[PDB]
Enzyme design. Sequence first.
Site, short mmCIF file in Angstrom:
data_model
loop_
_atom_site.label_atom_id
_atom_site.label_comp_id
_atom_site.label_asym_id
_atom_site.label_seq_id
_atom_site.Cartn_x
_atom_site.Cartn_y
_atom_site.Cartn_z
N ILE A 44 0.84 -1.17 0.00
CA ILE A 44 0.00 0.00 0.00
C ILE A 44 0.88 1.24 0.00
CG2 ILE A 44 -1.72 1.31 1.23
CD1 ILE A 44 -2.35 -1.48 2.71
N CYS A 45 0.71 2.08 -1.01
CA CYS A 45 1.38 3.37 -1.01
C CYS A 45 0.51 4.36 -0.20
CB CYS A 45 1.62 3.79 -2.45
SG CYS A 45 2.41 5.41 -2.54
N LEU A 46 0.79 4.55 1.10
CA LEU A 46 0.03 5.48 1.95
C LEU A 46 1.02 6.29 2.79
CD1 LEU A 46 -2.43 6.45 3.67
CD2 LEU A 46 -2.14 4.33 5.00
#
Lengths: 147, 138
Positions: A83-85
């Site tokens: 997840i790119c967060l």
Amino acid sequence: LTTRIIKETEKLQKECPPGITATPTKENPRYFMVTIQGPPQSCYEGGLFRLELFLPEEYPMKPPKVRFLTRIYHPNVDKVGRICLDIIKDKWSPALLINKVLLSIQILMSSPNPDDPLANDVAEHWKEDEASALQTAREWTRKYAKP
Amino acid sequence: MVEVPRNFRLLEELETGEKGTGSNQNVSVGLRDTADIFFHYWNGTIVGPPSTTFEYRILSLEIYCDENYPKVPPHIRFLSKVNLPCVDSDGTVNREKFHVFKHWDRRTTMELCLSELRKEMAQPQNRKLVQPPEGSTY
């Protein structure tokens, strides 16, 4: 099992944000099985998404590690669920809690960031033809995220 | 008097934490960096007391014990945003306003500092201070 982690565990069992569940494993209380319902009215609506989250040795100086297990078609999630967060990457602060991480993923499911610096093909699809991308996401939700 | 050197004072507090049974689960202190043998930075937790506007919040703090600890007090900063009189607008615990620091006794440990910040929240005067949204940081 620091006090912090124990109190966070309790808050996650009793007071998880609506739509979210988080439950530690017996063999490993730093390791959590997580579910997030696909947001209503989103392309993921109706699905139930399974994630896994781990508190590494250096938590809370370093963020929880967390990925999807359920496949999901999303500009900020790769083919193995990473997840790119920002808050579990470079915008982490030690005061933030797991609850907030999970809420942020729930929001990210309604509000993807296809203009995130790091290029990928799903983000490119979202930009090129958002309506088709959303359609693929619904199809993936039916295929892979059936409750 | 017999002054305990800083390093041995901090080893004492390290061991108190380690020997801790797990009973007191409303305040906690622990080494921040796994490899600093001089124990400069500590993580602190306070669980906001019941029947207050702080209640059950998991509040995070950073503790710095400099060259002169415990001859002078530790530097305590809230990482979680609070509305509390002895806490300045950058989260620093004010040395003239926190009773423990104003009248500093060597003997006071980082754990007692946190219990004493937690009592500050429970005081009749402070227990109703409007807090920022839960999870807020500076």
